[PDB]
Design an enzyme around this catalytic site. Sequence first.
Site, mmCIF file in Angstrom:
data_model
loop_
_atom_site.group_PDB
_atom_site.id
_atom_site.type_symbol
_atom_site.label_atom_id
_atom_site.label_comp_id
_atom_site.label_asym_id
_atom_site.label_seq_id
_atom_site.Cartn_x
_atom_site.Cartn_y
_atom_site.Cartn_z
ATOM 1 N N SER A 46 -3.139 -3.316 -3.902
ATOM 2 C CA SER A 46 -2.259 -2.793 -4.519
ATOM 3 C C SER A 46 -0.715 -3.164 -4.547
ATOM 4 O O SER A 46 0.079 -2.629 -5.193
ATOM 5 C CB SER A 46 -2.150 -1.065 -4.051
ATOM 6 O OG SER A 46 -3.382 -0.505 -3.946
ATOM 7 N N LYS A 49 1.621 -3.479 -7.354
ATOM 8 C CA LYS A 49 2.121 -2.552 -8.148
ATOM 9 C C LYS A 49 3.539 -2.188 -7.775
ATOM 10 O O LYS A 49 4.329 -1.815 -8.805
ATOM 11 C CB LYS A 49 1.534 -1.092 -7.585
ATOM 12 C CG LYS A 49 -0.156 -0.930 -7.823
ATOM 13 C CD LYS A 49 -0.691 0.241 -7.161
ATOM 14 C CE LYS A 49 -1.986 0.158 -7.503
ATOM 15 N NZ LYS A 49 -3.095 1.026 -6.702
ATOM 16 N N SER A 106 0.777 4.362 -4.614
ATOM 17 C CA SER A 106 -0.165 3.610 -5.051
ATOM 18 C C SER A 106 -1.164 3.918 -5.929
ATOM 19 O O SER A 106 -2.411 3.739 -5.876
ATOM 20 C CB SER A 106 -0.725 3.037 -3.702
ATOM 21 O OG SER A 106 -1.514 1.784 -3.965
ATOM 22 N N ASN A 108 -3.629 4.542 -8.955
ATOM 23 C CA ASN A 108 -4.319 3.853 -9.710
ATOM 24 C C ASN A 108 -4.283 4.089 -11.264
ATOM 25 O O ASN A 108 -4.064 3.288 -12.137
ATOM 26 C CB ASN A 108 -6.072 3.626 -9.387
ATOM 27 C CG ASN A 108 -5.903 2.655 -8.024
ATOM 28 O OD1 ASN A 108 -5.190 1.674 -8.055
ATOM 29 N ND2 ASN A 108 -6.954 3.108 -7.000
ATOM 30 N N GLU A 145 -11.402 -2.972 -9.723
ATOM 31 C CA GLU A 145 -12.203 -4.349 -9.788
ATOM 32 C C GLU A 145 -11.505 -5.290 -9.269
ATOM 33 O O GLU A 145 -11.884 -6.454 -8.661
ATOM 34 C CB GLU A 145 -13.052 -4.651 -11.056
ATOM 35 C CG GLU A 145 -12.342 -3.983 -12.420
ATOM 36 C CD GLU A 145 -11.942 -4.946 -13.503
ATOM 37 O OE1 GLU A 145 -11.102 -4.676 -14.348
ATOM 38 O OE2 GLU A 145 -12.405 -5.940 -13.351
ATOM 39 N N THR A 212 2.724 -1.528 0.117
ATOM 40 C CA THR A 212 1.517 -1.802 0.900
ATOM 41 C C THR A 212 0.453 -2.148 0.035
ATOM 42 O O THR A 212 0.475 -1.884 -1.224
ATOM 43 C CB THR A 212 1.157 -0.756 1.774
ATOM 44 O OG1 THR A 212 0.779 0.244 1.012
ATOM 45 C CG2 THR A 212 2.127 -0.217 2.567
HETATM 46 B B1 LIG Z 1 -4.231 -0.119 -2.885
HETATM 47 O O1 LIG Z 1 -4.134 -1.529 -2.807
HETATM 48 C C1 LIG Z 1 -5.510 0.535 -3.292
HETATM 49 C C2 LIG Z 1 -6.778 0.136 -4.163
HETATM 50 C C3 LIG Z 1 -7.793 1.191 -4.345
HETATM 51 C C4 LIG Z 1 -7.511 2.514 -3.746
HETATM 52 F F1 LIG Z 1 -8.324 3.503 -3.693
HETATM 53 C C5 LIG Z 1 -6.437 2.781 -2.711
HETATM 54 C C6 LIG Z 1 -5.316 1.850 -2.816
HETATM 55 C C7 LIG Z 1 -4.128 1.786 -1.990
HETATM 56 O O2 LIG Z 1 -3.532 0.787 -2.347
#
Ligand SMILES: *[B@]1([O])=C2[C]=[C]C(F)=[C]C2=[C]O1
Length: 267
Positions: A46, A49, A106, A108, A145, A212
Amino acid sequence: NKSDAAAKQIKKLEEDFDGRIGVFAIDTGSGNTFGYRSDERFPLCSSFKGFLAAAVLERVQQKKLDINQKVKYESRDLEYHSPITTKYKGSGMTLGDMASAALQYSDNGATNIIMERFLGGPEGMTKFMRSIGDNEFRLDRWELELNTAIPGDKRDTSTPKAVANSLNKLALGNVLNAKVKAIYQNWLKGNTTGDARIRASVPADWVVGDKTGSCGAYGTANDYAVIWPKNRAPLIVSIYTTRKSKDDKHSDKTIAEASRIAIQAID
Ligand SMILES: *[B@]1([O])=C2[C]=[C]C(F)=[C]C2=[C]O1
């Protein structure tokens, strides 16, 4: 000198948990640096990001995007680990809030929506990094993935060094104007996932911004941070770890320690 000792300790630490540790740290006051395997490839998780968030703010500052623009996604099937996008699915969220969610929780959902609609996917993400003169970074796949973290697999990797330099360019340098860099800093400062990592390594009245990463395979985790000590120029710290076996868990404390050793090396 003191460089040689810190390498001993890092070496001990990775053998202690049967894995691989990669560090790069910079003292922005003195020019002091320290690297252990700072040139080797590690899975991003992550952690990119945090750069995604920067790439957005970049587009905002060139006036290609408005930080307040509604982003709606009511019909989308939200990826696993979308805690912020999930609560606002019915109203949507501003581009700013969405970007910061990607960084601070974090998220998605936030990550993929932004890459499909604004940033031009993984390739678009990679192009952004190339444009700040980072040649190591490469995002190849989408969430989730990209987190496979198979040993030897170069997909979705960078190096501690390249991550350090990039954070430095973005958090402290020229890429963002005064107003936007400030926003970006506050975003990193407000990250919520990093209490047991680099943040645990510093005197608790230093100000820290971080992002992180945790892969959930090969005990792969990382952290990078910009740090403002009290009477002193900021530091940049970047710590990436992997382990030998698929089922291995990541180690917060190892990253904590490697941060502790790192910071002493550039002290
Ligand atoms: B990072 O690197 C990631 C990927 C996947 C998941 F379920 C969670 C997390 C936090 O940061």
